[PDB]
Amino acid sequence: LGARRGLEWFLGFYFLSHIPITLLMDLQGVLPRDLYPVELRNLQQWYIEEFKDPLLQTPPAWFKSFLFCELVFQLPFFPIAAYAFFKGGCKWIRTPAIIYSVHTMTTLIPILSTLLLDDFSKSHFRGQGPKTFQERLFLISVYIPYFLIPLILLLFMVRNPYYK
Amino acid sequence: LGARRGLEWFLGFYFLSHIPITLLMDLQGVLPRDLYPVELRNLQQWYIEEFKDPLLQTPPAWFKSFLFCELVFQLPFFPIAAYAFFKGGCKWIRTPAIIYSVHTMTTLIPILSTLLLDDFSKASHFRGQGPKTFQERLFLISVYIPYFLIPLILLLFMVRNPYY
Numbered sequence: 521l522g523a524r525r526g527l528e529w530f531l532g533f534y535f536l537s538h539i540p541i542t543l544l545m546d547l548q549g550v551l552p553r554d555l556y557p558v559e560l561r562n563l564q565q566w567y568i569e570e571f572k573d574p575l576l577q578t579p580p581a582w583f584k585s586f587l588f589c590e591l592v593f594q595l596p597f598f599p600i601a602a603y604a605f606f607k608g609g610c611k612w613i614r615t616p617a618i619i620y621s622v623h624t625m626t627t628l629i630p631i632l633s634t635l636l637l638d639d640f641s642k643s644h645f646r647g648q649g650p651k652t653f654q655e656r657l658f659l660i661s662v663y664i665p666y667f668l669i670p671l672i673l674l675l676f677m678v679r680n681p682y683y684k
Numbered sequence: 685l686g687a688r689r690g691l692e693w694f695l696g697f698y699f700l701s702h703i704p705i706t707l708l709m710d711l712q713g714v715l716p717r718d719l720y721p722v723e724l725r726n727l728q729q730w731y732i733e734e735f736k737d738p739l740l741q742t743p744p745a746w747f748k749s750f751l752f753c754e755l756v757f758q759l760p761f762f763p764i765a766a767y768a769f770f771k772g773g774c775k776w777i778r779t780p781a782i783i784y785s786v787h788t789m790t791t792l793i794p795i796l797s798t799l800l801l802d803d804f805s806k807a808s809h810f811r812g813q814g815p816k817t818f819q820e821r822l823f824l825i826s827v828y829i830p831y832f833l834i835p836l837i838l839l840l841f842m843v844r845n846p847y848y
């Protein structure tokens with residue numbers, strides 16, 4: 521297969537896998553914890569205590585607004601985009617995918633900037649976040665693919681003549 | 685004048701007016717104070733004192749990241765967009781305007797949510813700097829509202845207009 525067809529397969533698996541990541545992990549900061557079983561509640565508690573995540577446990581107002589945007593705007597677009605790139609040749613996904621890419625990239629620039637430069641001392645984060653530079657890379661590692669893959673998607677829909 | 689050409693003239697002045705607004709006011713939270721004369725530095729303090737803006741006074745990491753994007757991406761795009769909408773028939777601006785609109789519409793959803801839902805008392809990390817009453821919150825939101833609605837008008841205009 522081609523690099524174009526392979527990238528469409530990758531984008532489909534990215535949009536297909538983003539549905540359980542959002543419903544079962546990300547939305548635990550904006551949706552009540554009662555709706556989640558003790559297994560998933562404690563699984564997110566593992567990531568927060570091991571990766572030293574400051575945002576997921578007690579989301580600030582700016583991070584909660586992005587999680588609601590992920591619920592109302594991104595989650596419905598995931599199955600639509602998954603079908604579009606799994607099937608192939610869906611010219612109608614260009615503008616919707618560009619809007620998703622710029623939106624998602626804009627949400628993670630402040631996320632990556634906070635993890636890399638903000639103060640997580642016993643600050644309004646109250647020592648929840650990372651202290652060392654190595655612990656910050658462990659956190660940026662989980663968040664960075666959700667900026668690069670939309671970046672690839674933005675460049676892919678702007679120039680590909682098969683979607684114009 | 686028609687409806688489409690009238691909206692293009694309105695969009696031209698919006699991008700033209702944002703060049704001094706970004707330069708002489710917003711970028712004072714990222715650029716050194718010595719790059720600005722004493723007169724302009726008090727003009728921003730006059731705004732922070734009267735409108736009680738907690739973000740432009742001392743920018744948090746998430747708000748400062750959006751300001752760096754306004755310098756590297758938005759500011760170079762303003763003179764290009766003003767010319768294209770003043771001249772008319774510049775179909776090459778469709779995708780760049782969509783990218784600007786979605787990006788600008790994503791930076792303010794956290795801003796608008798923070799100014800209306802977050803606490804700015806002395807018990808918070810803002811240390812008592814910011815709006816207190818609901819009227820003071822809408823008085824500050826009023827300044828940031830046009831920069832979410834005007835891009836939204838631009839987004840819907842670029843998507844459906846057959847001339848672009």
Ligand SMILES: CC(C)CCC[C@@H](C)[C@H]1CC[C@H]2[C@@H]3CC=C4C[C@@H](O)CC[C@]4(C)[C@H]3CC[C@]12C
Binds near residue numbers: 564567590
């Ligand atoms: C135990 C394991 C599975 C925990 C996994 C943590 C990762 C996969 C979760 C936790 C925080 C989540 C992020 C929270 C916020 C956003 C911003 C949104 O606009 C894009 C998705 C994105 C970037 C989420 C991607 C998935 C994410 C990084």
Ligand SMILES: CC(C)CCC[C@@H](C)[C@H]1CC[C@H]2[C@@H]3CC=C4C[C@@H](O)CC[C@]4(C)[C@H]3CC[C@]12C
Binds near residue numbers: 750792
């Ligand atoms: C005296 C009057 C005219 C002053 C007007 C101040 C207004 C126009 C300025 C002050 C604060 C500015 C905002 C500061 C931050 C950003 C985030 C950036 O990503 C988009 C532009 C945006 C949203 C600016 C829009 C213009 C803005 C709202």
